[PDB]
Design an enzyme around this catalytic site. Structure first.
Site, mmCIF file in Angstrom:
data_model
loop_
_atom_site.group_PDB
_atom_site.id
_atom_site.type_symbol
_atom_site.label_atom_id
_atom_site.label_comp_id
_atom_site.label_asym_id
_atom_site.label_seq_id
_atom_site.Cartn_x
_atom_site.Cartn_y
_atom_site.Cartn_z
ATOM 1 N N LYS A 29 0.749 -1.235 0.132
ATOM 2 C CA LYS A 29 0.085 0.091 0.138
ATOM 3 C C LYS A 29 0.877 1.271 0.063
ATOM 4 C CE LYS A 29 -0.739 -0.298 4.967
ATOM 5 N NZ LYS A 29 -1.373 -0.487 5.937
ATOM 6 N N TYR B 40 15.934 31.375 2.878
ATOM 7 C CA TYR B 40 14.813 32.468 3.210
ATOM 8 C C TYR B 40 14.665 32.997 4.781
ATOM 9 C CZ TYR B 40 12.090 31.347 -1.190
ATOM 10 O OH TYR B 40 11.677 31.101 -2.433
#
Lengths: 374, 362
Positions: A37, A258
């Site tokens: 999965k 940043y």
């Protein structure tokens, strides 16, 4: 030959290594369901499925209908179980693609039955017990009825453990017994009874029933620190890799990235690596690290969407295009990132993005490159 | 006609709304570069790109060569700029696919020039200047000016552009930003003097676009704003009105009061969340327990009568937003958007009708 700058290297021999060790644990008569999965926990469900097929496992498990179809579309022939929810409008697609569906109520079994009747196919199902169907007599009768349905093949019965990796488990175990027992009394066959996840497989040898569901352990990772590791030897299969994009000597006192949340002290060698949060290297990490030529180095400043900065504070021979390891070798691991995050290894593995090509290795040779974009 | 349990609905009209409002900000001659890296910040780069072509922007920007190639494979013909690193192994594919490359050293330029010469095609480049982000690009000094002068001479290179990127343009204080622009100007002036021509000069990101009208130059780079989100809470939000384009949705799978919803961390609804919420029928509910790989459990503590299959909205409607998850996590809206997994189908809407569904699996 790898033209991407950032990739996930998947060592197929490790999967084989892990599975063979799992198998050593078990008697010959116990089936294995490989849990693939979420794109085989980020390893690539199709390629992993192909290997599992070679290695002769008995079932494959998925969480979504589409995950199953994806497998059929790629030539997988193994039985497939959708562990998760199947919405009503997907019943037909499931039946057509031969996906065993989990069922929780009689009512829904009836919906499925009608759909299979119109296709002229029997729908294979597993029943889920919540220890799903409550473990009680009222449910017992419900199943007995389900089994009557003409176009239902009631193949399996299962439950899932809340705490097998930390007994509550054995309480959950009791309830399922109450189920398996009453259903026997009534002659309802149930070919595959299964309850064991990865932790249970490891710690709970009494719980083998007709099949075990092997997930995190196939990938080479433990479900927790608590389980008996001494019991099973594992090798992680994934390495998250990149290259060095750029290098420069930065002067003292200079902000990086940043927000300028890191400031250089001293003249610092700074490398820039073309991996970011959009790759699944999450910005959330307080203490990010990379491995370059056997050394760990810190990631400095905010993680960008596509890029990170690294301080090289050791003498090592490095150039633009040298390899960088993010997790899966030495001291950089998914568990370590997970611990820093306050989450679990499974999540770090799942995070790895669409744009991150999976590069499959076998016998130490690159055998396949999968691009999800191209 | 949607077959997945969990999907991302992208409202094309909203992209248009955002774009037009961005355009209203700008004078007629300023070029727009639409930033579609990271699969258009989770929105789907190909569809967004198609919309951008239709609406006529001037450039598209990507972060990876492969991102550029994907667009070409879907028939995109606009100019595409790769903002970041191109490794050597990808030079040929770039040139062949008309992916404009960011360059920040003469040495790489020389290598590009060689591959280009062998192909007998000219390569398009933009020069990056590092003006203070300290990420990529040429240092802003005379040696670099010389290096660029030399680069410009390479026969098989078209030096189209030059840019920098701001570290702090979204903060209240603009001082660093202006300092960065000053660093760019030095280069621009020196090169102009040296006769290096340079058609497309650019510095502005979304925050600069909003807050710094003196920084337009030739072209601006619009990213987060395109998608209807602000770069920070500190920009002048009153200048630009935005609509978020994506709704992350699921439906109720099971009920017992706790509804189980088939979305989980594997879909990019991160487990890290300490205060996860969902929107059902206009009301917000708590997600309870740990987020699972493939599902969550929700507590219905109000009396509207939900039933299996009622719609669940994770973000993009009312009070459930990308920013709200971001607050919770200590990250930013950009990351929450980028988070949405491969298995989550992108469903495109226009005029309130579904016009396209993309499965990344099938």
């Amino acid at each position: 030959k790898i033209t991407v700058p950032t990739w996930a290297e998947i060592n197929l021999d490790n999967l084989r290594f892990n599975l063979n060790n799992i198998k050593n644990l078990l008697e010959e008569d116990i089936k294995i369901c490989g849990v693939i999965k979420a794109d085989a926990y980020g390893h690539g469900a199709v390629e992993v499925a192909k290997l599992l097929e070679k290695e002769k496992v008995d079932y494959l498990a998925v969480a979504r209908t589409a995950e199953g179809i994806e497998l059929r579309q790629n030539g997988i022939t193994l039985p497939i179980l959708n562990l998760g929810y199947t919405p009503d409008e997907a019943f037909e697609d499931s039946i057509k693609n031969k996906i065993t569906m989990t069922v929780y109520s009689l009512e829904t079994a009836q919906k499925i039955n009608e759909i299979a009747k119109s296709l002229g196919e029997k729908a294979c199902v597993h029943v889920k017990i919540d220890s799903g169907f409550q473990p009680n007599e009222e449910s017992v009768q419900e199943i007995i009825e389900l089994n009557k349905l003409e176009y239902i093949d009631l193949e399996g019965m299962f439950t899932h453990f809340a705490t097998a990796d930390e007994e509550y488990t054995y309480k959950q175990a009791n309830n399922y017994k109450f189920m398996s027992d009453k259903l026997d009394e009534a002659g309802v066959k149930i070919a595959i009874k299964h309850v064991s996840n990865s932790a249970a497989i490891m710690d709970c040898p009494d719980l083998r029933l007709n099949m075990v569901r092997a997930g995190i352990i196939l990938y080479g990772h433990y479900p927790s620190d608590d389980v008996f590791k001494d019991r099973l030897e594992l090798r992680p299969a994934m390495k998250l890799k990149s290259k060095i994009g750029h290098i420069k000597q930065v002067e003292p006192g200079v902000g990086i990235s940043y927000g300028l949340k890191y400031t250089t002290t001293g003249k610092e060698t700074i490398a820039t690596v073309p991996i970011g949060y959009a790759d699944g290297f999450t910005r959330i990490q307080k203490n990010p690290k990379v491995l370059i030529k056997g050394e760990v180095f810190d990631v400095v400043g905010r993680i960008c969407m596509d890029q990170i900065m690294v301080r090289i504070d050791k003498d090592i021979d490095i150039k633009v295009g040298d390899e960088v390891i993010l997790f899966g070798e030495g001291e950089v691991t998914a568990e370590r990132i997970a611990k820093d995050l306050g989450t679990i290894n499974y999540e770090v593995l799942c995070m790895i993005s669409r744009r991150v090509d999976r590069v499959y290795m076998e016998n130490n040779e690159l055998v396949q490159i999968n691009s999800y974009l191209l």
